[PDB]
Structures are given as C-alpha cells and as structure tokens.
C-alpha cells in the first residue's frame, strides 16, 4: 500500500449509507393554527411529479386551520396486528370409499398458496420471515364428532414418506409426531423459521438448476427450493380399516413477522398454485364502472 | 441547478441539461458485503474500473401505438465486455446498478413515460385464453437479453397485477414538456449475500407510455429511446471454467 | 393436587387469541438475518405513497383498458365548462379502487384523516391554460355551474414550468371516525364531491396538438389512521386453485 490511488481507494467499504431514519410515531400528527398568506416566491401548492416523490403540501399551507390535538393510536396497523390471525391454508380428506385417499392415509405438501384470502394477504410483500402456529380441526363430512384416534407426522425433505397405513416410517423415532383423538379439542403446536435463506420468497425470478432450458422443462421456472419445507402426513392408528370418513382442516397464524419490498396487490383471479397465471380472455378492470365521466 | 447534471464513473461520462433530480432506491447506496454477512470462505475479486462503467444497449422506437418494453438484470450484461466475462467465469456475483434512460423531442411534441424498477419480476401466461391450460412462458421470454421484450397486456403487467400501483416501486417520469431523462440508483436486493448471475434475475426494468405520443404532420416522426446502465461495487467468487448458460 | 375450577370458554378455538403452544423442534436455531433494503414496519407508511387514480373509469372493452388512467382536455368556448367529477370516498366503489390506499382501506372498517390528490399535465410546452378544482363538503348537491362550485374549498391551477398541482381534502366530519360509505343509511358517512372546471381556456399556437391528457395521483396525509381490521370485500377465486 504505497501507490496513492490504493491508499485513497474506497474499495471494501461495507457500511451501508442510509438517507432516512425512523422516528417514534405513537399517534397521528397534530394540526397547528394558520392564517392567510399573500406573497410571492413561495408556492407550496405547486409540485413536480416527474421527480418521483410524493407531494409535500400540508393542510396549514392550503387553507386556514384551527388547532387540533390528535390522539388516535396507530398500533393496529403494525405487521403483527395485520398478520397474527388464523386462516385456512389446507384441507385433507380421508373417505371410506372413493379414489382420492381410500387407504386411510394421506400426504400433503406444505404450501399456503391454495386459498385466495391468505395468499392475497401475504403476496403484498416479497420477503417475509416469521414463526408460525398451526391448529388442526378434524371431524366427519357432516360435522359429527366420533371416537377415533389419529396420528400426525412432520416429514422434512429427505426423510422416508409413508406409503401405507402400516408403513415402517410410522415408528417416528426422530420425526416429531402428534397423537390425538377427535373428541379432544383441536391440536396446536409452534413452528420456527426453518428456511435455509434469511427469508421466505413469494416470487423467484429464475431457474433452480443449470443447463439448457428446453420447453419440456418450463415447469421448473419460478420454483424456489428454499420455500419447500417438507410433507405433512396423517393416518388412522390401526391395522384395520376405520369405520368413519374423516376430514382435516389446517389453520396457520404468524408471529414475530418481518417484511421487505412491498408489491402491487393481485388484480385477477388465481388459477394455479405457485403460478401467477391469469385468464387472457377475461381481463377485468380493477374496480367498478359508470356511464359518463361528468355524472356520478 | 437541479436541471443540469453530470455522471462520471470508470472512463465514461454522461451529461444532461434537462434532468429531474436523482432517485436513490429505498434510500440506500450500494455497498460491499460485510464480514458478518458473508458465508463463502474464498477471497473474492473486485475488478473495479474495468467492470464499473456505463454500457449502452440497443434503441427502441416510440410510436403512437406503442405498448411498452421490459428488461431483466443482470441478464442484459451477461454477454458484454469484462463484466460479462467475469460473470460467466465465476459462480457467485453481487453488485448495484445505476440506470439512465434518454428520450428527447421538440417543444411541439407531447407524451409521458413511466420508468420503474420491480424486484423479482415473475412473468405469467394467458393460460390458453380460457384459463384451463397450465402453460408456462418460454425461455426467450423470461430472459430476453439485451434486446428486451414487448408487453402484451400492459394493464396487468403480464403478471395479473395492476399498473396503477406500480409507483410504490422506485420510479421516475419522462414528461416531454419538462425533462428528457430519468436516473435511478438501485442497491443489491436479495435474500442471500451472493447469487448466480446466470440463473437468477434480481429485478426488471419497465418503460410504459401512459400518455400517448402526439405531434402534428411535418414534425420529426422518429423518437428513439435509449437505455444506459452501469454496475456498482461488483464482486465475484467461485472461479472455474467459463459457462455461457 | 391444587384445587381448581373450570370456567365457561374452555376447549374453544378463537382464531385471534394470542397464546403459548408447545414447540416441535427443541434446541433449534434459525438462520441469521442479513441486511435487506426496504423493510416495512407499519402499514401507514405505504398509505402515503401516490398511485394512479382512475377518474375515467368509463370504458370496459379489453383493448381500451389502458385509457382508464387519463382524461382529456381541449379548447372550449370559454364559458366555464365542466371537465370531470368524482366522489371523495376512499373505501367506496369507484375511482379510488385502483389506488393502493383504497385496497389497504378495504381491510379496515373505519378511517380518519386528510387526503390529497395531485394532477399532472402532459401537454406540449406551448400549451397554456387555467383550471379550477373544487371540493364540496357533505350536504351540498353536485354543482351545476362554476359559480356554485366556487363557494366551497377550491384551488386555481395555472399551467407552467411546474406541471403538477396538489388539491388537499381536509378532514371535515361530525364524528371522529368514518365507516365505509355506500348507498342506503350508510351514506351518512359520505365525504363529498370533487369537480373540475375550465377557468379561462386551453390555448395553443399553430402546429401544436389540439388535445392533451391529465393524470391524477392520490395518497394520504400524515394524520391518517385506520382501525378495526376486517376481511376484504372481494375474494379472488372462483373455485378450487389447482
């Protein structure tokens, strides 16, 4: 380090320079008293939207205002207040006769993109990092409660998935498992943040693997392995067929939430899981329409 | 004072006389990766002046019936210069960007463009029109390269999201009666300290006309649009043989 | 053991209850969090960002959807003609549905605070004109002429080097909070009306286009607040997502 340009170089500066900083704001802003102004050179009402910043005009600079002390709280618009509410994310059916799951067991891939309400709420942001709380409600298709014993097992990726009601994988020597009866109140557990990355991704613009990207492999576009957390498996504890048909519903609630980079909200109807496809022949406007611009 | 500007980096310089200030995305300047955030153990390389410089892409034509175009980063520079060579010789990559868009006309023309940066821009399909087919976009559409791609349904941004809310992202306007350029500075945005430059695109750039271009007969009818961009604080790691894709 | 009694409310499952649940993975430690730009702490931060307001929500055909983001202005006979009108309710069906503020208000029942709308002129450099933009508090009907409209809150806009003007809609209400207004008895929570009139004229020289367009942007002030979170009015699903 003896030449001048290396000494004065700024290469390697790892400190991020921020232009803004956060300030406390427990309530809404107050209003100050203002009077009339008649002068030249000061134009609060004139803006330039081409810059890309929002208008900075206020109430006091446009009309004559009184003094109002505002004490309305802003606590209800925090991320946890918005997100810490349980919602339906999954549903598993175990019929006695049929074709879906006729052998008294089922395997469900963990994803929360199968229902519109939760998906639309969570897709407002790009990255999210949180803990979760899961509740399982089980009953017959008519809502009746019956004396049956069930077992839930969490299967992380790479672990053997059960393939029958008497599979050896049900020994759950290491995998976490829950035994519960239908007559009991719904089961409920806590889940940590388990992604290999620093946050979950609702949108991944890329491909998972290297190589040539032919037409037959286009289904891999947008698939992020960091969001795949495993499988949820359920069975009836017994060596014989059960005597009742059962349905299991799954609800999830977030805790300790953080988010980044908001995005525009969804406009069209959802069609497929983990795919932003839309019907091209049925594009509809965001809101309602009227008959003329000069009438209400 | 705020209408004239000069941008100098590397061995390139850009001058303008009708600027509209500079937007710094999310209020953060680009920076290098810290020791507490890094995970790879090998020493990275920082070519500095040979990669951090202004590059000019192709030129598009603005017409009275245009819809809009988009580009993907850093896919545009994958096959251009020393930056491209470093990108295809290394496994890991991270950098910021500075984007400048030029479009000039006369005092008798009119129109307005919206320039915005949308991180993780995922493209969708029309699902066969009826919405019953699970189709997927082709490779040439997701990573169009340095040529860009023309939008088909600009109202939904080809992804089922309204364009009216695109202003929530870092953006600027090009109003022909006010300015003729737009400048945006974007830091590195990702959930990982490093990532592959060939498989993953960090963000996309959108240029969509909201107010149609108009002029009277006899004026110049050719109104080009040019894109100029420059990496900032580039780092590479994981050296092995060059792969193009 | 310790004697106890069970009270009504046991064994129930309330979706908004905050409690403690048994962990599934003991001694598990998550991945460290690196710095990511653009963190959001409160939803009120997003309510102050301007988005395009669809004043011209007349057309419905597919190829003309993009025209909903602008409305035209041209030369008139100089008699204070009307340009456009719309309602000022942010949570009501209409123009405000295209803004992020309206979508966010769709998740809450009551709101309070001031609003602001910005208009940008996208004509040629040689075009000049003046416009009057008025806000009518609740109770008054839709104005029939400029003379009636000027009696309320208004601003006069002059075209020039600065291509944008801001109209501020101050909070004028009898209650501290307003619910989402609609037709019926709930029109009691209405906000008012906004109208735009020609002040002098739209003037251009020889060789300039005769028509120009105006783009409107809307957001909220710093005293805006919402409460009593609820579900959105519309569900974007018409069957089973599969």
């Amino acid at each position, epitope marked *: 380090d003896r030449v001048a340009d290396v000494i004065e170089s700024s290469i390697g500066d790892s400190v991020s320079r921020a232009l803004t900083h956060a300030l406390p704001a427990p309530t809404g802003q107050d209003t100050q008293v203002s009077s009339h102004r008649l002068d030249t050179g000061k134009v609060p009402a004139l803006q330039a939207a081409e810059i890309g910043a929002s208008s900075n005009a206020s109430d006091e600079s446009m009309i004559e205002t009184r003094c109002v002390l505002n004490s309305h709280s802003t606590a209800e618009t925090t991320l946890d207040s918005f997100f810490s509410r349980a919602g339906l994310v999954g549903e598993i059916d175990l019929p006695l006769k049929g074709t879906t799951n006729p052998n008294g067991y089922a395997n469900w891939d963990i994803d929360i993109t199968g229902y519109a309400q939760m998906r639309r709420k969570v897709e407002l942001f790009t990255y999210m990092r949180f803990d979760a709380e899961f509740t399982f409600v089980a009953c017959t298709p008519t809502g009746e409660v019956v004396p049956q014993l069930l077992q839930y097992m969490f299967v992380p990726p790479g672990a053997p998935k059960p393939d029958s009601r008497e599979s050896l994988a049900w020994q759950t020597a290491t995998n976490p498992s829950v035994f519960v009866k239908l007559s009991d109140p719904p089961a409920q557990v806590s889940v940590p943040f388990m992604s290999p990355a620093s946050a979950y991704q609702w949108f991944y613009d890329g491909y998972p693997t290297f190589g040539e990207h032919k037409q037959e492999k286009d289904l891999e576009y947008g698939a992020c392995p960091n969001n795949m957390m495993g499988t949820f498996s359920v069975r009836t504890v017994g060596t014989s067929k059960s005597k009742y048909p059962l349905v299991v519903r799954i609800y999830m609630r977030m805790k300790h939430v953080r988010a980044w980079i908001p995005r525009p909200m969804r406009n069209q109807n959802y069609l497929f899981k983990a795919n932003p496809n839309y019907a091209g022949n049925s594009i509809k406007p965001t809101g309602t*329409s009227r*008959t*003329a*611009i000069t009438t209400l | 004072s705020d209408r004239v500007a000069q941008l100098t980096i590397g061995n390139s310089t850009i001058t303008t006389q009708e600027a509209a200030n500079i937007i710094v995305g999310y209020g953060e300047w680009p920076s290098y990766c810290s020791d507490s955030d890094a995970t790879a153990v090998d020493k990275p390389t920082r070519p500095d002046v040979s990669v951090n410089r202004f590059y000019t892409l192709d030129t598009k034509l603005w*017409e*009275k*019936s245009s819809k809009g175009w988009y580009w993907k980063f850093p896919d545009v520079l994958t096959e251009t210069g020393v930056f491209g060579q470093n990108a295809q010789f290394h496994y890991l990559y991270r950098s910021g960007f500075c984007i400048h868009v030029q479009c000039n006309a006369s005092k008798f023309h009119q129109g307005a463009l919206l320039v915005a940066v949308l991180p993780e821009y995922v493209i969708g399909t029309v699902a066969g029109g009826t919405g019953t087919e699970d189709s997927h976009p082709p490779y040439k559409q997701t990573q169009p390269g340095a040529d860009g791609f023309e939008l088909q349904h600009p109202y939904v941004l080809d992804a089922g999201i309204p364009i009216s809310q695109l202003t929530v992202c870092p953006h600027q306007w090009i109003n022909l009666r006010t300015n003729n350029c737009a400048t945006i500075i974007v830091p590195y945005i990702n959930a990982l300290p490093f990532d592959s430059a060939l498989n993953h695109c960090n963000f996309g750039l959108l240029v969509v006309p909201i107010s149609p271009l108009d002029y009277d*007969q006899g004026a110049t009818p050719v109104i080009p649009i040019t894109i100029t961009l420059a990496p900032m604080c580039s780092e590479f790691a994981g050296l092995r043989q060059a792969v193009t894709q | 053991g310790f004697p106890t009694e069970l009270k009504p409310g046991t064994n129930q499952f309330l979706t908004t209850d905050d409690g403690v649940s048994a962990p599934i993975l003991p001694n598990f430690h998550p991945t460290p969090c690196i710095h990511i730009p653009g963190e959001v702490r409160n939803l009120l931060e997003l309510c102050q960002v301007e988005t395009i307001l669809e004043v*011209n929500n*007349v*057309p*419905t*055909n*597919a*190829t*003309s959807l993009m*025209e909903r983001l602008r409305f*035209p202005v041209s030369a008139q006979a100089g008699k204070g003609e009307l340009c456009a009108v719309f309602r000022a309710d942010p949570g009501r069906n209409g123009p405000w549905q295209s803004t992020l503020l309206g979508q966010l208000c769709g998740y809450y029942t009551q709101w309070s605070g001031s609003l602001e709308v910005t208009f940008m002129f996208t004509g040629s450099f040689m075009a000049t004109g003046k416009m009057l933009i008025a806000y009518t508090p609740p109770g008054g009907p839709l104005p029939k002429d400029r003379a009636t409209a000027m009696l309320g809150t208004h601003v006069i806009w002059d075209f020039g080097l600065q291509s944008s003007v801001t109209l501020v809609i101050p909070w004028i209400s009898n209650t501290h909070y307003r619910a989402h207004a609609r037709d019926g008895v709930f029109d009691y929570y209405t906000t008012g009306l906004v109208s735009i009139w020609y002040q002098t004229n739209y003037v251009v020289p020889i060789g300039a286009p005769n*028509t120009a367009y105006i783009i409107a942007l809307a957001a909220a002030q710093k005293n805006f607040t919402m409460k009593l979170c609820k579900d959105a009015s519309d569900i974007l699903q018409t069957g089973t997502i599969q």
Partner: antibody
Amino acid sequence: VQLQESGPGLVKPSQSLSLTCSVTGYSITSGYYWNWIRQFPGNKLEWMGYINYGGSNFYNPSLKNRISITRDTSRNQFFLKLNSVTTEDTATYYCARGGYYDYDGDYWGQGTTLTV
Amino acid sequence: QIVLTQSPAIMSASPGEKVTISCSASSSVRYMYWYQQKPGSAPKPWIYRTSNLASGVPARFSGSGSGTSYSLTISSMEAEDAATYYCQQYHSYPLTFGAGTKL
C-alpha cells in the same frame, strides 16, 4: 350487438348528406370505437372516421373540412354528415364497431347504397 | 399514410390445390389483419394478429409473416371459399386497406 344503416338513396349534387346507424344490444357509451367505412364501385375501401365512447372524433385528412360525426346517447344512435356532396361521393356506406389500435369486437353492419 | 400492396391481383385455382397470397407494407407493422367478402354482402373479419382464426372459420386457413411481408395460405381449395380477400392494418391512422385479391 346489431347495427342497421338508414338514409336517402338518392341525393342531388352540391347538397348535404345525412346517414343514421341504430345500435341494439349494447350501449354506445360503454366502450369501443364506432367507424364509418365506404366501398367505391371499383371495390376499393376507404376509412372515413370514428366517434369515441366519450364523444371524441378523428377524421381522415383527405375528407377534412367536409365530414362530421355526432351521436345521440338517449336513442343510442350515431350520425354521419357530409357537406357539398359531389359526383365522386357515390359508394356503399358501412358502419362498424372497432377497438383501439387492435382487433377487439369488429362487427360490421350491412351497408346502404347511395347514388348522387 | 401506410400503403399496402397485394399480389397477385387475380388468382385461379382448382379444388385440392395450394393457394397462397401476399400483402406488403411500406413500413414495419406489428400485425396484419385479413377480410373476406362474398359478392352482394359486407366484408367479414377472417384473420387477426396474423395467426388467430376468427369464429366460424374453417381450420384449413392459416396466416404468417413479419416485418413488412405477410402471407395468407389455404391448405385445400374448396368451392365455398372463393371470394375477394383484403389486408388491413391497425398500426396508425388513417386505417388503410389493400387493393384486394379475387380468387
């Protein structure tokens, strides 16, 4: 949607022309562009002009200062008027509904013959 | 104004043969549109966006082209599909039509 043209079949030279189109099954204020097109006896087609869903007009520069298109939203009709008709202005006149710089609905009428 | 040139002016073909007509533009356009007109009636849209088939059109029709050159082809010739065809553009106003091809 159905379109029907009507008007005089014979007009003396140097007079004024007026045609009428009636729309059924769709409101002319809900969208689309409504055009006027004529076909000369030599089987040559020429586009004349249009009226917008909101009342905006645009005319062919060759026919400028001689054409005017109006509308009547109450009765759901739009009109075509010509000034100082000459001998060369004889053709079959069609009315069509179109999109904005693209194919959207493109349903044509049946046409009415004019002799001058 | 954009000028469209159609060729050939007149074509004659036998059933089962291959028919191909071309339309050329004086400037680059995004798409090309086609019409069919039987004598005594009004023109009916046939092809839009150079590939999509209009409703009620037999599947033997197809179109292609890019830039300033576009073509319309018929796989098999029948007696029913014999009329005058036009090429029309939506790139800029005023809208212009081709001269027409009689089959």
